Symmetry: C3
Subunit: 147 residues, 3 copies
Amino acid sequence: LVMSSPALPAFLLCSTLLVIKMYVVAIITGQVRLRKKAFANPEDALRHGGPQYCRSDPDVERCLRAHRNDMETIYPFLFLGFVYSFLGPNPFVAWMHFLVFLVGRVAHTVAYLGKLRAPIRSVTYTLAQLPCASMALQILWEAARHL
Amino acid sequence: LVMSSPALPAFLLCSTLLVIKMYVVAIITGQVRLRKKAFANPEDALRHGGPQYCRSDPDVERCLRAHRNDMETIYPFLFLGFVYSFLGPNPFVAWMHFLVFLVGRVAHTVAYLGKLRAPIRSVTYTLAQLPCASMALQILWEAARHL
Amino acid sequence: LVMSSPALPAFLLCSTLLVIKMYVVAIITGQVRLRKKAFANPEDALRHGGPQYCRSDPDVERCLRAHRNDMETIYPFLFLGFVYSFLGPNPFVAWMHFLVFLVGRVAHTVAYLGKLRAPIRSVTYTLAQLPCASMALQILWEAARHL
Ligand SMILES: CC(C)(C)C(=O)N[C@H]1CCC[C@H]1CNc1cc(Cl)ccc1C(=O)O
Ligand SMILES: CC(C)(C)C(=O)N[C@H]1CCC[C@H]1CNc1cc(Cl)ccc1C(=O)O
Ligand SMILES: CC(C)(C)C(=O)N[C@H]1CCC[C@H]1CNc1cc(Cl)ccc1C(=O)O
Ligand SMILES: CCCCCCCCO[C@@H]1O[C@H](CO)[C@@H](O)[C@H](O)[C@H]1O
Ligand SMILES: CCCCCCCCO[C@@H]1O[C@H](CO)[C@@H](O)[C@H](O)[C@H]1O
Ligand SMILES: CCCCCCCCO[C@@H]1O[C@H](CO)[C@@H](O)[C@H](O)[C@H]1O
Ligand SMILES: N[C@@H](CCC(=O)N[C@@H](CS)C(=O)NCC(=O)O)C(=O)O
Ligand SMILES: N[C@@H](CCC(=O)N[C@@H](CS)C(=O)NCC(=O)O)C(=O)O
Ligand SMILES: N[C@@H](CCC(=O)N[C@@H](CS)C(=O)NCC(=O)O)C(=O)O
């Protein structure tokens, strides 16, 4: 049940929103492929104009990079945040961890796909990693002391 | 324990089968690399014929795309389906969610690696995403109402 | 709580260390990008010397491959190992599963980024996959018998 720990509802809200955000990136990628006529597969290209459309595109590649960075960061959060929710952290402190990650990651996607000037994207990445590092260390201590 | 919720055994069966399915894709990728003599690393190439075999191959790239799409879809399911199992959904309805994803994703890999005509692969992707979207929204409501 | 099962603390220790190890790979990737002046984005390149630095680099690509292989292997472990911890396995046997994966994966990153001769990296990959396959099969039987 969602009320297994005081921090769990907040974690589940933020995590699920971020999963949906990743799904949005996937949809955008597909739409960009269609609009720019840039497909990764010959079977896709032949359906949508001909073999010349099996090609790379800078905007498609950008979408893929944003999606991959999401996989490099959001997936670890899904694990760390879940475990962290059951360590009995301060409700407000836990909320701040999840919110900083949520805001940081949404901002990251906006900065990436919106082609915002450096180092905006890099800063959003680093900001979002901070609560992840914090949770990781807290889990390490709790796990180690229970060995 | 597996009987913590009525939907959990079905989720664990489908998810673990899909993880194994991803492992199979990894093995296939390696086998294709060896057969087509197309390695990503100079150290691999020098062991298997010479430096000229550090090269890209369309079939290897296809395998990597299928594997990456798995990571973009199956990993979120592992999270969403687990949480969803504990929300007390209708046993049959939950089973249908997991089965549609399982069948959709297996079909996706067959359509991708088998080079089936468009839009077969795209349809299997979309079909499998439907129960994921459904579970995501259900988790959102449950999490939000417990805040 | 961490003491929900005898195997859980060991799992959480190994998994969190591996997540941190992935974060280290991400940091290394960024550092290599800066040192070799090889950026994936024009906005990054213009900040760090000019448009000519939006380019690929073999060392950066190697870092990305190591990170991707981590995503292909460590993420499934996070799921499998968590579920496996609650199946009531022998404490020592469970510990061995987690340790073999931890050692195998750390060795994999060292072998990859350190450019060690073949088949060292391939062996570390295979070694680490063994406990994952073992856990997957055990989960399959437990899930199937509870249907
Ligand atoms: C949202 C996604 C699916 C990611 C997207 O927009 N993908 C695009 C990239 C290449 C294929 C294209 C989608 N094409 C189709 C998809 C379906 Cl479900 C049915 C019919 C077609 C068709 O081509 O008629
Ligand atoms: C199933 C996997 C491991 C993914 C696969 O078939 N990988 C292939 C891609 C490039 C390396 C090659 C596997 N090579 C080896 C692997 C081991 Cl464990 C021992 C010895 C060798 C050898 O080269 O003698
Ligand atoms: C550790 C990471 C963030 C992955 C890394 O070393 N990334 C490098 C790859 C390209 C951008 C570069 C980091 N640049 C910055 C990052 C911040 Cl938080 C603030 C200012 C700058 C700056 O450029 O002044
Ligand atoms: C959850 C998905 C987040 C969507 C954020 C997309 C940001 C789009 O932002 C757009 O980027 C374009 C360049 O790509 C610019 O030309 C436009 O000025 C800008 O509005
Ligand atoms: C879990 C892994 C799923 C394996 C599905 C592989 C589908 C292989 O399918 C094969 O594809 C070839 C083109 O690649 C065709 O030439 C063959 O006719 C076809 O049998
Ligand atoms: C958790 C991250 C693991 C870091 C392992 C990095 C291994 C670095 O190893 C280095 O590799 C270089 C080639 O890249 C060689 O030139 C050096 O001799 C070697 O020391
Ligand atoms: N895989 C990443 C590792 C480092 C990283 O996550 N960097 C952040 C901040 S510079 C980023 O937004 N990278 C862009 C990307 O991953 O495409 C990369 O190659 O850049
Ligand atoms: N990363 C995906 C995002 C969109 C997506 O998942 N599309 C589905 C249906 S067209 C797909 O099978 N993509 C092929 C792939 O990911 O390689 C892509 O580039 O296509
Ligand atoms: N995606 C992998 C699938 C197979 C795999 O995981 N192989 C192992 C052992 S050869 C590996 O270290 N691959 C290197 C990599 O993924 O970049 C690949 O292309 O090689």
